[PDB]
Write a protein that binds this ligand. Structure first.
Ligand SMILES: *[C@@H]1O[C@H](CO)[C@@H](O[C@@H]2O[C@H](CO)[C@@H](O)[C@H](O)[C@H]2NC(C)=O)[C@H](O)[C@H]1NC(C)=O
Ligand SMILES: *[C@@H]1O[C@H](CO)[C@@H](O[C@@H]2O[C@H](CO)[C@@H](O)[C@H](O)[C@H]2NC(C)=O)[C@H](O)[C@H]1NC(C)=O
Ligand SMILES: *[C@@H]1O[C@H](CO)[C@@H](O[C@@H]2O[C@H](CO)[C@@H](O)[C@H](O)[C@H]2NC(C)=O)[C@H](O)[C@H]1NC(C)=O
Ligand SMILES: [Mg+2]
Lengths: 337, 47, 215, 107, 96, 505
């Protein structure tokens, strides 16, 4: 894109035309165009547990409405279960034979053995209010941290105009936990931290774990100030010394920004003015200089280092002892690895 | 691993997926038997 | 004569094309050829000029499609230098697509329709994967009437049939036709044409092909 | 001429992705061959503009200068309909024709 | 049998996705590594900048006509995205 | 792949990990691999600029590429041999980023002006580590700076990707593939990652990385990799068959010496054998080649002493066969080096001012000389090690020729056994195998500095333990084999091959 000068000389006549083609940001674009899709997952109440069926049971309800001027014709429902969940067979037989509703026999007679993706055909969906249906789901695989499920809707003449919803019992709406700093977004689907319980507090073992490539840097820090935001907040930490030289230089020791997701404030809130011992990996810091920010994640480890006057309690005496031995140990002897 | 399944690391992925290939040129210079040249070209398949 | 590696391309991909230059006796001739590539509305975007002498009547050329492009029909047009009014052309399409895994053929029992046939038009569906295996799925098929450039759609001729053993069957009855049209005269329908549009989706829900029989 | 493309191997089990195979090309001696291998799925998306030998002869038939399947209204019309000019010392000669196209095709 | 997955792209460009599978009790395995385009939000636009008539004899006077074309402002442009300038000229036949 | 160009200018950086994650036995295999590699590189005749650095917590520089001593293979081998695992055992860290920074500094020019030939120069980096960089920052970013310094990826017209090649050796019992795969260069169908098991079968390892671009036609260069067949190990071996009525079928061996010429014995053939009835098949091809002319030595005469009363006289048992078409050298088709040539001078790693007399003394000292010949057993080539009796037992080796049937009544032993004969065989100092009659005409091979020089041609043996396809029973103690010395007919070969461009001194 540049400006230029046109110069024409001589007898005759002509026409000048200039067109620019570029990528323009979408203005009020409707991703779920012509579709209002709502999906809700809930556990089964006490009526299900009454005959002592004794198993993991949840109810999935789906509702949708067309936005067009008239009712939309035949459409298709693509449903993906959470991993290890199979829909209740008896619920689908009841829904299948209903009017404006059909499920293929080849899909129907599959049952629990392989029914993970489900295809439901509707001859039409009303445009004035929501049309709904529901069925039970049961876990039969017994695995934790299940994959979120999804339901996609589209019509036989156009897959382009479509809509997709996700569901997960703990992620509320089944959306991904991405972290965004204005225009720059990066994923944050992790545990908040490793090892803050410490029932058996070691020192020799921790030195061996500090000598592994997964630990890129070990910092002694002091929290200066916390700055709030919407779904995150940043923690202004002062770097005191680099116990292990990491991906970045010490730079005398100045403020470096650490950020925690809103779902990690509930797990553990750091307290200001206090010192902290931390270590992580190269994937933790984010952005480009000088706007680098350290994201607290499942590879990050943090523990409070009490101040001098706080060290005098007999149990925090030994903590200030052991946290001081790790200090001198790493710098002078390094690693035999 | 000691069990009866292939380990992940030694599983090598197919990745060559071009739509069109074998954009080559060749001249029929093989010995003409009944005026018809028989050419043999060993070609690499894709994934 | 103009040859291309594919019939339809993606934005941001390379286009390879070869031009065969022959005289009126179809033997290879060595002359200078003027080549032009035009956009959907006929705007030349790229042009070439090369002689086929000592190349045995073959001119291999290439061009890259930018990401900034207007999808639609694109045409390669060529003419000899000593005959600029005699222009040859061949077309290709630009679209954002994904490769299917199976083909859909819609076969009427007769490649015509007799108006007063009581049974109606029978169209056999045939679907198979690209590697030669039978397709299992469900298809949605719709009918319409084509008169010149004017297309009329019959909404109630829509049917939903499963695809079994790599095949299906659908029949457009005479009653649906008489009900589809508002004209009780059968004489006005003679000379017009029908068209069939089929939408097939596997029972895995991971692929979909739209096929058309017309005329 | 005559150009034929077949497999170099006799038959064997269906090929493996990426595997080396032998392609056999039979054709007249001295001819230059150009190759292109495309996935059949692309043609299911778009089968238009595919060139073939029959369509080559179709353009030739559409480029013929003759307008009559033989015979004619008279002796003078025979050559002029075929696409020929005739002239003799005696005086008999072909009908004058100044148009490349054939007048109103039957279609 | 189909196994769905849910993912989120993290960086623009033609990014790569790889999956592997191996069967039990037979040493038969397969892996698929494919790439798809990660496109920033938006869509292609073909807007017109300016159209003017050229006539050096009548316009501009004394056989010369010159005028500038300012660059497009495009305030809705997606950051760090391509932008092409399409220039076309066509003469007017002045022979009756 | 690494290119071998004699006109080249190439820097080779050797980085060896020394952390406690390796182990002593693994560290030794790392050195033994480098010693064989450097030796094989110098055997090809390319002299690169070697840089030798060992690192753990802190890198330790042994050889700098700026030094002229860096081009000395034996001197660098001495520096490498001196390196000990326990040199800095107490600092057994893994700080790979600093080690790459030292290499980056070596190729770095002072100020902003690179010396001429910077892009003309090839750069090769060889790294051995456990893939566990635990101290310091990311090491991969320094690789980009090395890619940066070498102007790689900076031009569409000139990529310069082949001016830098990165090989990584996975050493130690525990190893990380992920970091290793990132460090190594990525090129189409080229291996740059090697594991611990690769320390065995070293020749195959080098076969993947070595590119013989400018050394295809060099003499006496052999591929010893395990997958290689008979002719990968013997490129010069030539099989000659003559089938003619009355004479019948007969086969002898030959050795490639030039583009058109193959060297073999004379008593196998005769002038009456016609050129169309003689078929030659060179190693690596089963197609029988047509010949043009056969050059028997002028002083050859099988019946030289037939009228005197001696049945057969094998003096000057050499012949040159000229092929109708010229050979194209390859990995299985290469000549064997000849004494007093520029190729033999470079093969022995001697200065170009070395004389023909000095090379004769080195090849033939006044002692028992180790040697070997090639023989066929069920159509497969195999090597048999023998001793050339040039020492104190040289007289006993010549005397044992009288026990061959047909020469019992010769009074003077020095009369029949001419100075052309080289004498092998016997049981002292050790048992030397005896040749088959089909093995005649083959070369007599001596190994020096990872190369092979021809010193003789197989003539005849005293006792024919290999009478016909069977070599049964152990050999007599006086069973000797005789070979024609090359120095006696060297002037004639120099006369014939003066236009063949072999660089005779
Ligand atoms: C310019 O933008 C239009 C946006 O629709 C592109 O598509 C054309 O849209 C009009 C609707 O106003 C249709 O009538 C045309 O048929 C569409 N084009 C084609 C090729 O079908 C259009 O392609 C863009 N580019 C140009 C050069 O017009
Ligand atoms: C490289 O080092 C490893 C261990 O450091 C060696 O592994 C040995 O394997 C044998 C197998 O019989 C064991 O009995 C030993 O206890 C192992 N450790 C030793 C010897 O320290 C491995 O053999 C070494 N590689 C080579 C080529 O020597
Ligand atoms: C090293 O640097 C130059 C660039 O500064 C390299 O490019 C060559 O430049 C010369 C003269 O400018 C050209 O004649 C060559 O064709 C260039 N080589 C290419 C384009 O590959 C060149 O490699 C080196 N120059 C030398 C050795 O003089
Ligand atoms: Mg280590």
């Amino acid at each position: 894109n540049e400006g230029f000068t046109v110069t024409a000389e001589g007898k005759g006549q002509g026409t000048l035309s200039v067109v620019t083609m570029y990528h323009a940001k979408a203005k009020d674009q409707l991703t779920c165009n012509k579709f209002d899709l709502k999906v809700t997952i809930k556990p089964a109440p006490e009526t299900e547990k009454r005959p002592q069926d004794a198993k993991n049971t949840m109810i999935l309800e789906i509702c949708t409405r067309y936005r067009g001027d008239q009712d939309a014709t035949m459409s298709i429902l693509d449903i993906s279960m959470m991993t290890g969940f199979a829909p209740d067979t008896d619920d689908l037989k009841q829904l299948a034979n209903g009017v404006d509703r059909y499920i293929s026999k080849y899909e129907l007679d599959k049952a629990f053995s392989d029914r993970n993706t489900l295809i439901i055909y509707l001859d039409k969906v009303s445009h004035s209010e929501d049309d709904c249906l529901a069925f039970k789901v049961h876990q039969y695989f017994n695995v934790e941290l299940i994959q979120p499920g999804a339901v996609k809707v589209y019509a036989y003449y156009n897959l382009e105009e479509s809509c997709t919803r996700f569901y997960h019992p703990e992620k509320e709406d089944g959306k991904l936990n991405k972290l965004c700093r204005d225009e720059l977004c990066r994923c944050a689907e992790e545990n908040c931290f490793i090892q803050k319980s410490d029932d058996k507090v070691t020192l020799e073992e921790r030195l061996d774990k500090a000598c592994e490539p997964g630990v890129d840097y070990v910092y002694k820090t002091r929290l200066v100030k916390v700055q709030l935001s919407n779904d995150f907040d940043e923690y202004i930490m002062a770097i005191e010394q680099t116990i292990k030289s990491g991906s970045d230089e010490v730079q005398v020791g100045q403020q470096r920004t650490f950020i925690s997701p809103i779902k990690c404030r509930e797990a553990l809130k750091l307290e200001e003015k206090k010192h902290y011992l931390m270590w992580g990996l190269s994937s933790d810091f984010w952005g480009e200089k000088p706007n680098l920010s350290y994201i607290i994640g499942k590879d990050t480890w943090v523990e409070h280092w009490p101040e001098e006057d706080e060290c005098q309690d007999e149990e925090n005496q030994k903590q200030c002892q052991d946290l001081g031995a790790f200090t001198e140990s790493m710098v002078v002897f390094g690693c035999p690895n | 691993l000691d069990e009866d399944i292939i380990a992940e690391e030694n599983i090598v992925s197919r990745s060559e997926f071009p739509e069109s290939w074998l954009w080559n040129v060749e001249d029929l210079k093989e010995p003409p038997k009944n005026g018809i040249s028989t050419k043999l070209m060993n070609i690499f398949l894709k994934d | 004569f103009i040859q291309t590696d594919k019939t339809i391309y993606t934005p941001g991909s390379t286009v390879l094309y070869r031009i065969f230059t022959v005289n009126h006796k179809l033997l290879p001739v060595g002359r200078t050829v003027m080549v032009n590539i035009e956009n959907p509305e006929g705007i030349p975007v790229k042009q070439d000029s090369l002689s086929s002498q000592n190349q045995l009547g073959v001119l291999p050329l290439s061009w890259d499609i930018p990401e900034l492009v207007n999808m639609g029909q694109w045409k390669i047009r060529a003419y000899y230098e000593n005959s600029p009014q005699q222009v040859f052309s061949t077309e290709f399409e630009v679209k954002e697509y994904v490769l299917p895994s199976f083909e859909v053929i819609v076969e009427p029992t007769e490649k015509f329709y007799y108006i007063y046939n009581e049974k109606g038009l029978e169209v056999t569906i045939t679907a198979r994967f690209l590697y030669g295996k039978k397709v299992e799925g469900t298809a949605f098929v719709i009918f319409g009437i084509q008169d010149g450039e004017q297309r009329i759609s019959l909404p109630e001729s829509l049917k939903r049939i499963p695809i079994e053993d790599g095949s299906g069957e659908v029949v457009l009855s005479r009653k649906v036709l008489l009900d589809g049209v508002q004209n009780p005269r059968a004489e006005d329908l003679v000379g017009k044409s029908l068209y069939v549009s089929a939408t097939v989706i596997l029972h895995s829900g991971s692929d979909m092909v739209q096929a058309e029989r017309s005329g | 001429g005559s150009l034929v493309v077949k497999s170099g191997q006799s038959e064997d089990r269906q090929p493996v992705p990426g595997q080396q195979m032998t392609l056999k090309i039979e054709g007249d001696h001295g001819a230059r061959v150009v190759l292109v291998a495309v996935d059949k799925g692309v043609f299911v998306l778009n089968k238009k503009n595919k060139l073939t030998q029959s369509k080559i002869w179709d353009v030739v038939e559409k480029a013929d200068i003759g307008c009559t399947p033989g015979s004619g209204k008279d002796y003078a019309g025979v050559f002029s309909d075929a696409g020929l000019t005739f002239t003799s010392s005696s005086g008999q000669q072909t009908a004058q024709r100044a148009e490349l196209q054939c007048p109103q095709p039957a279609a | 049998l189909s196994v769905p997955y849910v993912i989120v792209p993290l960086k623009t460009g033609l990014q790569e996705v790889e999956v592997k599978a191996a069967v039990y009790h037979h040493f038969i395995s397969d892996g698929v590594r494919k790439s798809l385009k990660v496109v920033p939000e938006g869509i292609r636009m073909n807007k017109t900048v300016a159209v003017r008539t050229l006539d050096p004899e009548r316009l501009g006077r004394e056989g010369v006509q010159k005028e500038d074309i300012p660059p497009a402002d495009l305030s809705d442009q997606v950051p760090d995205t391509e932008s092409e300038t399409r220039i076309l000229l066509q003469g007017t036949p002045v022979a009756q | 792949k690494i290119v071998l160009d004699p006109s080249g200018s190439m820097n080779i950086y050797l980085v060896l990990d020394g952390s406690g994650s390796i182990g002593a036995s693994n560290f030794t295999g790392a050195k033994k691999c480098l010693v064989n590699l450097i030796e094989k590189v110098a055997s090809y005749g390319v002299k690169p600029r070697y840089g030798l650095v060992t690192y753990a917590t802190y890198p330790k520089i042994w050889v700098k590429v700026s030094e002229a001593d860096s081009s000395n293979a034996d001197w660098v081998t001495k520096q490498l041999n001196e390196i000990n695992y326990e040199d800095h055992k107490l600092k057994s860290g893994t700080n790979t980023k600093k080690a790459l920074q030292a290499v980056y500094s070596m190729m770095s020019w002072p100020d902003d002006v690179p010396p001429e030939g910077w892009n003309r120069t090839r750069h090769v980096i060889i790294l051995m580590t456990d893939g566990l960089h635990n101290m310091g920052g990311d090491p991969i970013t320094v690789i980009d700076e090395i890619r940066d310094l070498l102007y790689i990826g900076k031009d569409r017209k000139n990529p310069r990707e082949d001016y830098l090649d990165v090989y990584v050796f996975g050493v130690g019992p525990l190893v990380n593939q992920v970091n290793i795969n990132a460090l190594a260069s990525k090129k189409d169908n080229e291996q740059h990652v090697f594991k611990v098991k690769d320390m065995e079968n070293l020749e195959d390892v080098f076969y993947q990385m070595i590119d013989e671009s400018q050394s295809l036609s060099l003499c006496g260069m052999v591929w010893e990799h395990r997958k290689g067949t008979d002719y990968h190990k013997q490129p010069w071996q030539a099989k000659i068959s003559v089938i003619r009525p009355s004479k019948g079928h007969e086969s002898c061996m030959g050795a490639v010496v030039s583009e058109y010429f193959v060297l073999t014995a004379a008593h196998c053939f005769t002038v009456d054998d016609k050129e169309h009835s003689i078929k030659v098949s060179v190693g690596g091809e089963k197609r029988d080649l047509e010949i043009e002319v056969v050059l028997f030595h002028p002083n050859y005469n099988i019946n030289g002493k037939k009228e005197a009363g001696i049945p057969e006289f094998y003096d000057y048992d050499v012949a040159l066969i000229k092929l109708k078409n010229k050979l194209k050298y390859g990995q299985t088709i290469r000549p064997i080096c000849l004494p007093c040539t520029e190729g033999t001078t470079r093969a022995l790693r001697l200065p170009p001012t070395t004389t023909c007399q000095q090379q004769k003394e080195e090849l033939l000292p006044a002692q028992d000389i180790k040697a070997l010949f090639v023989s066929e057993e069920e159509k497969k080539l195999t090597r048999k090690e023998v001793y050339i009796k040039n020492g104190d037992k040289k007289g006993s080796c010549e005397r044992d020729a009288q026990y061959a049937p047909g020469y019992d009544k010769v009074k003077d032993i020095s009369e029949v056994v001419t100075p052309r004969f080289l004498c092998t065989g016997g049981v002292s100092p050790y048992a030397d195998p005896n040749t088959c009659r089909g093995d005649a005409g083959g070369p007599l091979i001596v190994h020096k500095r990872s190369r092979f020089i021809q010193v003789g041609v197989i003539s005849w043996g005293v006792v024919d333990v290999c009478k016909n396809q069977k070599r049964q029973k152990q050999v007599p103690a006086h069973a000797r084999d005789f070979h024609i010395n090359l120095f006696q007919v060297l002037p004639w070969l120099k006369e014939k091959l003066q236009d063949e461009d072999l660089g005779f001194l």
